Amino acid sequence: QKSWIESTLTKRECVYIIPSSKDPHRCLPGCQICQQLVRCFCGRLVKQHACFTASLAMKYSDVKLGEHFNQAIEEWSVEKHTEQSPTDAYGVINFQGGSHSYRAKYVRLSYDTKPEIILQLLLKEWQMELPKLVISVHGGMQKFELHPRIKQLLGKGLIKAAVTTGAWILTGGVNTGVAKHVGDALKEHASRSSRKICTIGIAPWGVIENRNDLVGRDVVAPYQTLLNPLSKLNVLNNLHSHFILVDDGTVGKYGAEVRLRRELEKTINQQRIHARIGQGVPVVALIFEGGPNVILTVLEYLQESPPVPVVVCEGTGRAADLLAYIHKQTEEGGNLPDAAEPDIISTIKKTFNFGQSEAVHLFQTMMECMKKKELITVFHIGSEDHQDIDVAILTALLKGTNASAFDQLILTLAWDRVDIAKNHVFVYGQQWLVGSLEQAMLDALVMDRVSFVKLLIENGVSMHKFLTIPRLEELYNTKQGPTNPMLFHLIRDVKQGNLPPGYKITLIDIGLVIEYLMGGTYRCTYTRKRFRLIYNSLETKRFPYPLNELLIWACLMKRQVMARFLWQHGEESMAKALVACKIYRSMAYEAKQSDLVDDTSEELKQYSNDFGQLAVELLEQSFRQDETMAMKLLTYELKNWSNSTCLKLAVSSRLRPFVAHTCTQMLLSDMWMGRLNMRKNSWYKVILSILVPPAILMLEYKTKAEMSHIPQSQDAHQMTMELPITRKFYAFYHAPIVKFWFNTLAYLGFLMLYTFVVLVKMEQLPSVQEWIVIAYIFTYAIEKVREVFMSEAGKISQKIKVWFSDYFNVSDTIAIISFFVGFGLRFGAKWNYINAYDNHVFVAGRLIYCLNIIFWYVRLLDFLAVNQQAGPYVMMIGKMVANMFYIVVIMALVLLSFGVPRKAILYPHEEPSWSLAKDIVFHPYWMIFGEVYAYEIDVCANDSTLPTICGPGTWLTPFLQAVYLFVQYIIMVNLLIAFFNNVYLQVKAISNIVWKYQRYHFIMAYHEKPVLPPPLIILSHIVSLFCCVCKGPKLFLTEEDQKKLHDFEEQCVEMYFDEKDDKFNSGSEERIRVTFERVEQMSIQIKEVGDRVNYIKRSLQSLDS
């Protein structure tokens, strides 16, 4: 059948035909007009049946020969006499309205369908999500139009409680009264709740127009909105999204689906609202402007397992208004004052004439209702009585079940309605159980309900008592919220690749991931020995800083809004912002380095760059408050973050805006100085004091209190306890500024010598210069080996791959390797003694020297890149060479487009030679630089310097070269000028930041270096190997300075959040929009105080009476 429906659902066909009233209408001949008229006790006439039991029977009479014995006339019950058959009407209707083709899903089932079957159709076939609420609207039909305000409120509130609680508004479907007002309400607040509210009208197949059109198995069946000018029949309504078209008989009989609606009001009740929540899906009843049989239906609800409550809408109509007044004028839960029956029954009488026979019979259906006032609710329209029905409806299911507030809260948690929990569940007098808000917190954290995690903390939930090991294990092992599916791909990549099917994640496995995403020497709290013991054994199972364990959780589970919540809570804000930037940055890299449908890396890198900006904006906040303590905030050991450092975490994530921030750049400036005050010293005197040692003792050093914000070495800090003479030398030579200038002078003296050796005759044996030069490069290479070993992450391959990423460190290896090839050939070569350069081993050795020296001039740009002005130009040069590449490839093609025709036209008689690869490229290249070769153009001229090249076709070449230079000089060189002019500012801005960023790695490399430059360094190397087989900088605070610093951190985070709102709130965009919203509210009130005074001036001539 290719439809789950047809195998399952059916219709009803009235197989059996029975008489009507038995009166043939008029018109004496009775036998055939019996065929013309006789509405079966079905309700359709004999011929409208078309049934196969009744198709070849009208020939004789029909079913049931003769009178059939009046008793047996009273025997048609559809059960025996109407057949279940395959559906014939399920599809998608379409409404003809402005730009909305509004769709639905009609089914056409028999009323006998099992209630399980219905819910299945709704959920799997129609692919609907189980609702968090069901608002079953019951009212009267053809209720013309409600007053303008009362339609606005019941039109905003029903939509607001259905868009926020994902609810199914069960209805009647007929475009008259209830469904008519529900639909208009939808249309007045559509397109914000469009694909969120699912409105199922349960209509009969009786009172239904274009009934024959809806027939058609699996169709896009059409439908109209032109109300049939004559008909009492009813049309389905525009905005209802689904339809249950029950069938038992025919037209009329609008009472066979009432039982099926009740089934769906039950079967949803037995489903759990959420996988974690034990409460069933709620069901509420909304009465507005009802009927005579409403108050009957109301009675049924409040007498069931459990009592489906009722929210009545007074001020709209008759039954609501009746039911409004009666339960309002009731005893607390019971009878009335001195008999109120006179007014009540009179009140009941005017709506509906009953008249003491059954106007009393209402008083019984009207007593048990008001006796159940606790379950009944009423929205007093026009009295701000719970702020449209959304509060009232949702409230109705919390107050009227005498339920625990645990269940009342959790319902709000599944609804995501914090206001209803904070204004009706956390109200004064509420008394909670020992750990019930904890179970709410556990559900809010898993369900990613940040706004309840806020509330549960604000009330009393301590995350120190809350957060334990076995619980925080659960939080990783959930699928009941927003998840990072990569956390398993990461936990796989650390646990050797094997994940058993269960594999309940362990915190030790999370610690291994945090070590891998944070890189280097990071050691998490979970991988330590002290945790692997308490863990496998299982206050001690409670973590000391819980909100640092959940910040990581929220990040590893890719829960930014929870991460951007738990970050404000707790201490070490700037640290956690730089960790998170690092976790997301590594999570992002491993997402791009993997195969997956959703890349989830532009999401993670943005998440990383969101916390990276929080750290910078807190640094700018601390720096604007105190500069000295802000620099201390960059270098204190964290002690919950692997003894790391907020700066070290930023350098780990290449978070350049933080390292290029003026605070770090000023600390970096102060670590460069050392104990020397270069504000009352000059570079002349540092150089002078390197060459004149006793001039070290005439320059200004820095006190211990001008060195407290500066991370130091231990030995350096041990000489802040006392300045004596030998201490004053240890302060000079160990400053990074001095190690620099003490290396530059050796390096400049090195080039002066190596320039001399390369320009002067090189004899058999190396001269004293060339020995001094080899010694430098030899020991300089030992230093680079030592730099690589004593670097960072113990994996030999990592230290390698880092050091070979800098430009000049690649050049250093070529420069060092090439020099000792050249020395091997130079020194290892048999001198000829007739004349040098007859030995080609010797020549090759020298020519490597003459080329190796180019590496060593270009390395001066690394020394010159220490200046604030020069260095950004040096980095800039390379960023431009990379960006001008494709312009220069075009310039190389125009070159060959010219050199090959020229060489071919001017030298026709050439055999193949390697000189043909020079001559196609040589002169055309030197033309780019202004050499025109004027007397080689027009080789047939008299002034020509190539008179023998004159021959056939050579008159073409001056035309060719005229085009060539026009292209190269007038187009391509000036296009490259234009390139540089329009890319200058942005490469200069990048190069300033990359310069400021790499000033960390540079300055911090000159703390670790020995004191002696690369010729005499070997002493320092040897001394460091002696004390290796015989025996970086840190910020030392006393315990009171750590206190004063954690205060300063806290105080500056407060000023950050305070000043962020004070700016947002004090902005014209915010002041226009709240002004906008107040003038709305006022205007409403001004046309209501304006109404009241219009009801006062009428009361000047009435009181006059």
Ligand X SMILES: C[C@@H]1CC[C@@]2(OC1)O[C@H]1C[C@H]3[C@@H]4CC=C5C[C@@H](OCCC(CO)CO)CC[C@]5(C)[C@H]4CC[C@]3(C)[C@H]1[C@@H]2C
Ligand Y SMILES: CC(C)CCC[C@@H](C)[C@H]1CC[C@H]2[C@@H]3CC=C4C[C@@H](O)CC[C@]4(C)[C@H]3CC[C@]12C
- CB of 1000 vs ligand POV, minimal distance in Å: 14
What is the secondary structure of 481-502 as a DSSP string?
S---THHHHHHHHHTTT---SS
Alpha-carbon span 869 to 879, nearest angstrom? 17
522 binds, among its own copies, ligand X, ligand POV, none (CB under 5 to 8 A by kind): its own copies
Closest residue (Cβ) to ligand Y? 854
End-to-end CA distance of the chain: 80
- What DSSP designation does 177 have? T
For residues 898 and 1000, which CB has a smaller minimum distance to ligand X in the complex? 898
By CB under 6 A, name the binding residues for ligand X.
896, 912-914, 916-917
Burial 892-927 (b: 16+ CB within 10 A, else e): eebbeebbebbbebbeeeeeeeeeeeebbbebbeeb
For residues 881 and 1093, which CB has a smaller minimum distance to ligand POV in the complex? 881
For residues 278 and 912, which CB has a smaller minimum distance to ligand POV in the complex? 912
- CB of 247 vs its own copies, minimal distance in Å: 26
| Whether residue 24 has a cis bond before it, omega within 30° of 0 | no
Alpha-carbon span 942 to 255, nearest angstrom? 118
916 binds, among ligand Y, ligand X, its own copies, none (CB under 5 to 8 A by kind): ligand X
Alpha-carbon span 561 to 475, nearest angstrom? 16
Letters for 58-97 (x = contact with its own copies by CB under 8 A, - = none) are --------------------------------------xx
Letters for 850-889 (x = contact with its own copies by CB under 8 A, - = none) are ----------------------------------------
The 3 state secondary structure assigned to 883-924 is: HCHHHHHHHHHHHHHHHHHHHHHHCCCCCCCCHHHHHCCHHH
Residue 914 phi, psi (nearest 5): -65, -20
Of the residues 855, 863, 873, 925, which one makes contact with ligand Y according to CB under 6 A: 855
Residue whose token pair is 């035909």: 17
461 binds, among ligand Y, its own copies, ligand POV, none (CB under 5 to 8 A by kind): its own copies
For residues 488 and 933, which CB has a smaller minimum distance to ligand POV in the complex? 933
Nearest to 515 by CA among 650, 655, 641: 641
**Residue type for position 290:** G
Could you tell me which residues are beta bridge partners of residue 468? 542
Alpha-carbon span 794 to 153, nearest angstrom? 69
Whether 386 contacts 392, CB under 8 Å: yes
Site for its own copies in 672-701 (CB under 8 A): none
363 binds, among its own copies, ligand X, ligand Y, none (CB under 5 to 8 A by kind): none
Residue whose token pair is 């369908």: 113
For residues 14 and 562, which CB has a smaller minimum distance to its own copies in the complex? 562
Whether 153 contacts 389, CB under 8 Å: yes
- CB of 784 vs ligand POV, minimal distance in Å: 4
* Separation in Å, CA 78 to CA 6, 58, 65: 21, 20, 20
For residues 150 and 1012, which CB has a smaller minimum distance to ligand POV in the complex? 1012
For residues 222 and 749, which CB has a smaller minimum distance to its own copies in the complex? 222
Site for ligand Y in 1010-1029 (CB under 6 A): none
**Residue type for position 377:** T
For residues 467 and 895, which CB has a smaller minimum distance to ligand X in the complex? 895
For residues 854 and 877, which CB has a smaller minimum distance to ligand Y in the complex? 854
211 CB-side CA count, 13 A: 18
- CB of 770 vs ligand POV, minimal distance in Å: 9
921 binds, among ligand POV, ligand Y, its own copies, none (CB under 5 to 8 A by kind): ligand POV
Q: Candidates 292-300, 398-406, 514-522, 792-800: pick the segment binding its own copies (CB under 8 A).
A: 514-522
Whether 576 contacts 584, CB under 8 Å: no
Alpha-carbon span 225 to 326, nearest angstrom? 39
Q: Which burial class, exposed, middle or buried, applies to 982 when counting CB atoms under 10 A from its CB (0-12, 13-18, 19+)?
A: exposed
Nearest to 855 by CA among 768, 751, 927: 751
For residues 198 and 777, which CB has a smaller minimum distance to ligand Y in the complex? 777
Whether 649 contacts 579, CB under 8 Å: yes
For residues 240 and 903, which CB has a smaller minimum distance to ligand X in the complex? 903
- CB of 920 vs ligand X, minimal distance in Å: 6
- What DSSP designation does 676 have? B
- CB of 811 vs ligand Y, minimal distance in Å: 4
For residues 895 and 1004, which CB has a smaller minimum distance to ligand POV in the complex? 895
Binding of its own copies at residue 642 (CB under 8 A)? yes
360 binds, among its own copies, ligand X, ligand Y, none (CB under 5 to 8 A by kind): none
Of the residues 596, 841, 858, 892, which one makes contact with ligand Y according to CB under 6 A: 858
For residues 72 and 877, which CB has a smaller minimum distance to ligand Y in the complex? 877
Neighbours of 31 (CB within 10 A): 8
- What DSSP designation does 25 have? -
96 binds, among its own copies, ligand POV, ligand Y, none (CB under 5 to 8 A by kind): its own copies
For residues 506 and 608, which CB has a smaller minimum distance to its own copies in the complex? 608
Binding of ligand Y at residue 811 (CB under 6 A)? yes
Estimate the share of the chain in helix, then strand, then coil, as percent rounded to the nearest 5.
Answer: 55, 5, 40
62 binds, among ligand X, ligand Y, ligand POV, none (CB under 5 to 8 A by kind): none
Nearest to 139 by CA among 303, 314, 339, 307: 314
CA 38 to chain centre: 68
For residues 763 and 1054, which CB has a smaller minimum distance to its own copies in the complex? 1054
Alpha-carbon span 222 to 225, nearest angstrom? 11
Site for its own copies in 537-596 (CB under 8 A): 568-569, 571, 579, 582-583, 586-587, 590-591, 594, 596
524 binds, among ligand POV, its own copies, ligand Y, none (CB under 5 to 8 A by kind): its own copies
- How are beta strands 310-313 and 284-288 bridged, if at all? parallel
Token pair belonging to 665: 């750049």
Of the residues 27, 854, 963, 1005, which one makes contact with ligand Y according to CB under 6 A: 854
Token pair belonging to 518: 């944070």
Count the residues in the chain: 1105
Alpha-carbon span 828 to 1051, nearest angstrom? 70
For residues 309 and 924, which CB has a smaller minimum distance to ligand X in the complex? 924
Of the residues 851, 896, 904, 978, which one makes contact with ligand Y according to CB under 6 A: 851
Site for its own copies in 412-431 (CB under 8 A): 428
864 binds, among its own copies, ligand POV, ligand Y, none (CB under 5 to 8 A by kind): ligand POV
254 binds, among ligand Y, ligand POV, ligand X, none (CB under 5 to 8 A by kind): none
Radius of gyration of the CA atoms of the chain, in A: 45
**Residue type for position 652:** S
Nearest to 377 by CA among 363, 392, 388, 390: 392
Alpha-carbon span 719 to 731, nearest angstrom? 9
- CB of 987 vs ligand POV, minimal distance in Å: 8
Residue whose token pair is 């050392």: 674
40 binds, among its own copies, ligand POV, ligand X, none (CB under 5 to 8 A by kind): none
644 binds, among ligand X, ligand POV, its own copies, none (CB under 5 to 8 A by kind): its own copies
Nearest to 732 by CA among 802, 670, 677, 796: 677
For residues 243 and 898, which CB has a smaller minimum distance to ligand POV in the complex? 898
Site for its own copies in 450-479 (CB under 8 A): 454, 457-464
Residues that bind ligand Y (CB under 6 A): 811, 851, 854-855, 858
Residues that bind its own copies (CB under 8 A): 96-99, 101, 144-145, 222, 224-227, 428, 454, 457-464, 484, 486, 489-490, 493, 514, 516-525, 568-569, 571, 579, 582-583, 586-587, 590-591, 594, 596, 600, 640, 642, 644, 652
